[PDB]
Symmetry: C3
Amino acid sequence: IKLYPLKKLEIILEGAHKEFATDLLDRAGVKGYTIVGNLSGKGSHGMYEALIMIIAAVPEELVGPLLEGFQPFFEAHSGVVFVHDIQVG
Amino acid sequence: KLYPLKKLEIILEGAHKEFATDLLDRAGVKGYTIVGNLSGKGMFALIMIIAAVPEELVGPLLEGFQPFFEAHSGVVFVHDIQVGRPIKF
Amino acid sequence: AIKLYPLKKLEIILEGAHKEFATDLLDRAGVKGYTIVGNLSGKGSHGMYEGHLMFNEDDALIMIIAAVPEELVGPLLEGFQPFFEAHSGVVFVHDIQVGRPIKFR
Ligand SMILES: Nc1ncnc2c1ncn2[C@@H]1O[C@H](COP(=O)(O)OP(=O)(O)O)[C@@H](O)[C@H]1O
Ligand SMILES: Nc1ncnc2c1ncn2[C@@H]1O[C@H](COP(=O)(O)O)[C@@H](O)[C@H]1O
């Protein structure tokens, strides 16, 4: 009935690091997340068949802090974060 | 070679899938992709329905999804996208 | 501190039996990675797709997620055209931001 801007993260990583991730989201004040499982992917590390994708809608001011919190991680582990623009009602 | 369109990401409990797809059909949506067996915290057995739709279906669709999400878990993310041949949509 | 850069993201939806055709196109174009979401269901112009119903799971619909520099979008769609004229499926092109362009281009 009224659309508001927001950001949406797609966070793709190895499932063994999921707790760390969802845990880190919680501390930034993210209010929810949905997780897509049993993925397969091709990367610099060359192949998988696992991996998960965490979808998180978050206010734009949280983007910075989250990317910063995930920095040390992706600099030592496989994975990627895609930042989207979205609207929610 | 690309035209503008909108893409919905509809996250909700699986028991309500038919309610959700009836809304898409009844509204004129020509197609949809369903991602299954999700997990979440968020109020996003969860599924995500991906629907590419002309912008002028967005209002009407959200209108139907409103009373539902006031009484049930879930969310709707609206995205901007481009496609090659909109007629298909 | 962390700068963001513009990029495009494809969602490619098609029958699983054509996965190799699709990924060959990505590899040839110079796409550096992709993520595949499996065992999907869908409604198309003609019929339902329910991979829970498939006998060989490598036959259900899949969605290929590919982050790609904008200048690969044209070429990729060009290859995906004749395919989608003769087969089920669709491509959605998204705008996105990433922290590390070099990982994608
Ligand atoms: N508007 C849409 N939004 C999301 N997914 C779609 C849409 N249209 C088609 N799809 C996906 O593509 C699949 C095949 O669609 P389509 O090519 O129209 O099939 P068919 O050849 O049987 O008409 C669908 O099952 C669905 O997953
Ligand atoms: N360009 C990309 N597009 C989509 N997914 C990607 C991309 N690059 C990496 N990924 C995902 O991230 C995983 C790890 O890649 P890497 O970080 O290179 O090890 C891959 O298996 C993919 O699932």
